Design an enzyme around this catalytic site. Structure first.
Site, PDB file in Angstrom:
ATOM      1  CG  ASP A   1      -2.300   0.479   0.901  1.00 17.32           C
ATOM      2  OD1 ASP A   1      -2.427   1.677   0.580  1.00 17.32           O
ATOM      3  OD2 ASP A   1      -3.251  -0.329   0.976  1.00 17.32           O
TER       4      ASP A   1
ATOM      5  CG  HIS B   1      -5.495   3.441   0.958  1.00 15.59           C
ATOM      6  ND1 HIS B   1      -4.914   2.362   0.317  1.00 15.59           N
ATOM      7  CD2 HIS B   1      -6.838   3.287   0.749  1.00 15.59           C
ATOM      8  CE1 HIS B   1      -5.838   1.608  -0.245  1.00 15.59           C
ATOM      9  NE2 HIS B   1      -7.019   2.169   0.015  1.00 15.59           N
TER      10      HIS B   1
ATOM     11  CB  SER C   1      -9.407  -0.122  -0.440  1.00 12.88           C
ATOM     12  OG  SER C   1      -9.175  -0.005  -1.837  1.00 12.88           O
TER      13      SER C   1
ATOM     14  CG  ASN D   1     -13.823   1.117  -4.474  1.00 14.55           C
ATOM     15  OD1 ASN D   1     -14.146   0.076  -3.906  1.00 14.55           O
ATOM     16  ND2 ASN D   1     -12.753   1.782  -4.079  1.00 14.55           N
TER      17      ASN D   1
HETATM   18  C1  LIG Z   1      -9.623   1.228  -2.410  1.00 14.78           C
HETATM   19  C2  LIG Z   1      -9.325   1.143  -3.763  1.00 14.78           C
HETATM   20  C3  LIG Z   1      -9.102  -0.022  -4.199  1.00 14.78           C
HETATM   21  C4  LIG Z   1      -9.069  -0.402  -5.596  1.00 14.78           C
HETATM   22  C5  LIG Z   1      -9.403   0.555  -6.583  1.00 14.78           C
HETATM   23  C6  LIG Z   1      -9.579   0.164  -7.955  1.00 14.78           C
HETATM   24  C7  LIG Z   1      -9.487  -1.170  -8.340  1.00 14.78           C
HETATM   25  C8  LIG Z   1      -9.094  -2.060  -7.365  1.00 14.78           C
HETATM   26  C9  LIG Z   1      -8.875  -1.668  -6.002  1.00 14.78           C
HETATM   27  O1  LIG Z   1     -10.552   1.711  -1.985  1.00 14.78           O
HETATM   28  N1  LIG Z   1      -9.525   3.106  -1.895  1.00 14.78           N
HETATM   29  C10 LIG Z   1     -10.112   3.654  -1.074  1.00 14.78           C
HETATM   30  C11 LIG Z   1     -10.933   4.295  -0.092  1.00 14.78           C
END
Ligand SMILES: *[C@@]1(/[C]=[C]/C2=[C][C]=[C][C]=[C]2)=ON1#C[C]
Ligand SMILES: [Ca+2]
Length: 274
Positions: free
Chosen positions: A32, A63, A220, A154
């Site tokens: 990530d 994230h 995610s 998404n």
């Molecule tokens: C997560 C993102 C993940 C992805 C995108 C496009 C294709 C495959 C995988 O959720 N950010 C946030 C809140």
């Protein structure tokens, strides 16, 4: 006081944790945007960075820290609790602060994990297009005994149009969709024949950059739930191969409706962990 995110009980993670199985000795790599290692509710043991200018132990996005908390937020008297709080967490930064990274950086992160004995790889990322080098890396990581979990996407759905992104769309990768606390599909969860299982992805509360906690939506968020479930199963049956663990997860999932929309259903780790 420690908060217990609705995703833990919904996938019966609390039931297997109670038996004393919490991911101990299972190595999990979160590909990530890095992880805020200093976070008091997380224990990062190592990692690597393939993003120029950024160390693996810093998260300027939020994230990766969020995804990492969903998988292993420490079990204590503060913050939240992860699906597998005893798992050995590895931060592999393959995305930058803006939430983007190259294909090279990703396949590099995949190779590093496979080479360094990672048991599970979580990729809460995806793209509209894949690569041959990407497919090669994932297939070889799987064939070598690594469980590969990826967010489905998404892009919700259309009218009979597969919206599963890469690498989720690959055979050797488990494409994870998203449901809410009511166990209903979240309107943003991608759909298609590659959808494999569902997990909590809406209104998910987890660790966030600079010693705090936030709520996010997305597939995610769902992915780390399955990566953590895979770790729980492995800590109970360390003799299992990637495909067996993978099989356990999908064969015991709670049917919810059409597979094009829910895959095999919502995962159940109590049933999966045997
Ligand atoms: C997560 C993102 C993940 C992805 C995108 C496009 C294709 C495959 C995988 O959720 N950010 C946030 C809140
Ligand atoms: Ca905690």
């Amino acid at each position: 006081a420690q908060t217990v995110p609705y995703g833990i009980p919904l996938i019966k993670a609390d039931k297997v944790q109670a038996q004393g199985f919490k991911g101990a000795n299972v190595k999990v790599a979160v590909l990530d945007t890095g992880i805020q290692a200093s976070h008091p509710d997380l224990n990062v043991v190592g990692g690597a960075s393939f993003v120029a200018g950024e160390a693996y132990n810093t998260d300027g996005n939020g994230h990766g820290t969020h995804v990492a908390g969903t998988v292993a937020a420490l079990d204590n008297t503060t913050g939240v609790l992860g699906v597998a709080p005893s798992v050995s967490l590895y931060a592999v930064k393959v995305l930058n602060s803006s939430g983007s990274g190259s294909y090279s950086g990703i396949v590099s992160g995949i190779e590093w994990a496979t080479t360094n004995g990672m048991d599970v790889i979580n990729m809460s990322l995806g793209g509209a297009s894949g690569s041959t080098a990407m497919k090669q890396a994932v297939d070889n990581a799987y064939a070598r005994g690594v469980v590969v979990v990826a967010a489905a996407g998404n892009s919700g759905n259309s009218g009979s149009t597969n919206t599963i992104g890469y690498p989720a769309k690959y055979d050797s990768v488990i494409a994870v969709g998203a449901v809410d606390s009511n166990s209903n599909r979240a309107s943003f969860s991608s759909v298609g024949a590659e959808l494999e299982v569902m997990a909590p992805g809406a209104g998910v509360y987890s660790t966030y950059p600079t010693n705090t906690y936030a709520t996010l939506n997305g597939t995610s968020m769902a992915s780390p739930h399955v990566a953590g479930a895979a770790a729980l199963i492995l800590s109970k049956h360390p003799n299992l191969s990637a495909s067996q663990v993978r099989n356990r997860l999908s064969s015991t999932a709670t049917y919810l409706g059409s597979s094009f929309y829910y895959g095999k259903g919502l995962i159940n780790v109590e049933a999966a962990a045997q």
